[PDB]
From Swiss-Prot:
GO terms for biological process: diterpenoid biosynthetic process; hydrocarbon biosynthetic process. Mg(2+) 1 binds at residues 284, 288. The gene is ISPS. One of its GO terms (molecular function) is isoprene synthase activity. It comes from Populus canescens. This is Isoprene synthase, chloroplastic.
Length: 531
């Protein structure tokens, strides 16, 4: 059928003094759509265009155009011949195809090996192709050994590189890929970086470049508006000021939400997740350092009973904390009862009851100086991260028609939200591993892994790294098909993982990097286009 219905992100709506900005955005967008649709353009060129469009942060806007292009690139058999011509073309086309649900085999790289079954060592000459292969390897599924091998062959060459041999441009490109592959970096962060990079190319498509900048700043404006309303709500609750021991992480929480749902039409999800993580921060502090087991026991009990007529059992500080959570969640339940005509309160309260219990378990292991095996510890840790609770709330804010089966699967911690949480927990612990280890702390996935396997931090650190890689492959299959959930929500879940990779780094300085990123994504707009 024909679809003439409007999009929640069309400039005609998002840009309703400004009339000037709208017309230009639409004109630029029109020309870009024409290019992606160019029926007579060199295939490799078409693919490189799609790649920039996406890297610059505009893929969500030309989603159907790109699928259409990839479709005729396959039917015409342009892909079959490419897998025999260039490595760069194969890898790039492979990544874009798999990314868009297309069925591709790892055997498309078998033609770049030798009799020994190894990639031709001379391929390292074309650094560009090596970068492409690298990026594509990350979309590997379980079993695809060729891709795993390709990732190895790629990193070897990229590390042994230098600006002097490839140039300041390609060099900056290699360092970026290594820092974090495209498939794992959040879309908003990758866009800021690519836009700064593209605007320096002497042959960069000006129309596309202006559109990227204009669109990026437009979306950022929504975030600022979103954060403004949420900052008002937060300050209204005043929970952060009344609890002298608690730390305020509203801005950091919002930054985190942007990684989960960057599309402008997702303000609710963005706000729901920002608010939720904000409460998680305070409650986490309550169980981690402030509360005594007797009190923690009472609070946990209160969240399970979800009875407002029993807050007088809690000590003053928890009494305030509990009522704030109680109302906030009931608020969200109301919104859903009003919009979807469904009572989801049980699902939201269960998520919170579960989290608190995970927090309680850690408080107990800590108090009793217990030493659970990695499996028991981690099993509890990926839940205490709040990752699945955040996804359960995201669900109701992302899907229009909720399905009893889907929510029941989320309630059972289906792979869709558990896998990303595994990564969430692992990236957090990895970043603080060295610190907590040299301090005698054992409450950390890496530390726990060390004790459970009896190996060095270096050894354990690698094991955790490989653990993440495996999780990504299983996570990639979920999105590729055979999922109970709609692909849109599968991507949301995965974004939690992506955000995890970005908010947890080694270090520019660590605290310095977290400041720059939050500013480049929320506060400071991108410098206007220069002709």
């Amino acid at each position: 059928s024909a679809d003439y219905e409007p999009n929640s992100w069309d400039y005609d709506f998002l840009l309703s003094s400004i009339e000037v900005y709208k017309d230009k955005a639409k004109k630029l967008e029109a020309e870009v759509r024409r290019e992606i649709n160019n029926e007579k353009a060199e295939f490799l060129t078409l693919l490189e265009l799609i790649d920039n469009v996406q890297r610059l942060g505009l893929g969500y806007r030309f989603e159907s155009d790109i699928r259409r292009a990839l479709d005729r690139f396959v039917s015409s058999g342009g892909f079959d011949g490419v897998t025999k011509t260039s490595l760069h073309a194969t890898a790039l086309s492979f990544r874009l195809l798999r990314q868009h649900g297309f069925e591709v085999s790892q055997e498309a790289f078998s033609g770049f090996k030798d009799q020994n079954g190894n990639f031709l060592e001379n391929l390292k000459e074309d650094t560009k192709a090596i970068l492409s292969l690298y990026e594509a390897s990350f979309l590997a599924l379980e079993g695809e050994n060729i891709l795993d091998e390709a990732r190895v062959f790629a990193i070897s060459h990229l590390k042994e590189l230098s600006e002097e041999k490839i140039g300041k441009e390609l060099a900056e490109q290699v360092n970026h890929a290594l820092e974090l592959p495209l498939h794992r970096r959040t879309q908003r962060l990758e866009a800021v970086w690519s836009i700064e990079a593209y605007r320096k190319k002497e042959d960069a498509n000006q129309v596309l470049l202006e559109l990227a900048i204009l669109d990026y700043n437009m979306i950022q404006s929504v975030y600022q508006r979103d954060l403004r309303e949420t900052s008002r709500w937060w300050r209204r609750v005043g929970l952060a000021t009344k609890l002298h021991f608690a730390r305020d992480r509203l801005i950091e929480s919002f930054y985190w939400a942007v990684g989960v749902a960057f599309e402008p039409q997702y303000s609710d999800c963005r706000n729901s997740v920002a608010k939720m993580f904000s409460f998680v921060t305070i409650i986490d502090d309550i169980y981690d350092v402030y509360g005594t087991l007797d009190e923690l026991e009472l609070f946990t009990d209160a969240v399970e009973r979800w009875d407002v007529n029993a807050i007088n059992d809690l000590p003053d500080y928890m009494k305030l904390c509990f009522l704030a959570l109680y109302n906030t969640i009931n608020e969200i339940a109301y919104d859903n009862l009003k919009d979807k005509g469904e009572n989801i309160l049980p699902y939201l309260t269960k998520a919170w009851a579960d989290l608190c219990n995970a927090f309680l378990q850690e408080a107990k292991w800590l108090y009793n100086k217990s030493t659970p095996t990695f499996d028991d510890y981690f099993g509890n840790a990926w839940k205490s991260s709040s990752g699945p609770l955040q996804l359960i709330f995201a669900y109701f804010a992302v899907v229009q028609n909720i399905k009893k089966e889907e929510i029941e699967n989320l309630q059972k911690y289906h792979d869709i939200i558990s896998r990303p949480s595994h990564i969430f927990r692992l990236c957090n612990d990895l970043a603080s591993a060295s610190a907590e280890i040299a301090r005698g702390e054992t409450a950390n996935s890496v530390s726990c892994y060390m004790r459970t396997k009896g190996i060095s931090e270096e050894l354990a650190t690698e094991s955790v790294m490989n653990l993440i890689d495996e999780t990504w492959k299983k996570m990639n299959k979920e999105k590729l098909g055979g999922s109970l959930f709609a692909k849109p929500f599968v991507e949301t879940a995965i974004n939690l993982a992506r955000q995890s990779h970005c908010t947890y780094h080694n270090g520019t300085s660590p605290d310095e990097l977290t400041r720059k990123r939050v500013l480049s994504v929320i506060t400071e707009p991108i410098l206007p286009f220069e002709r």
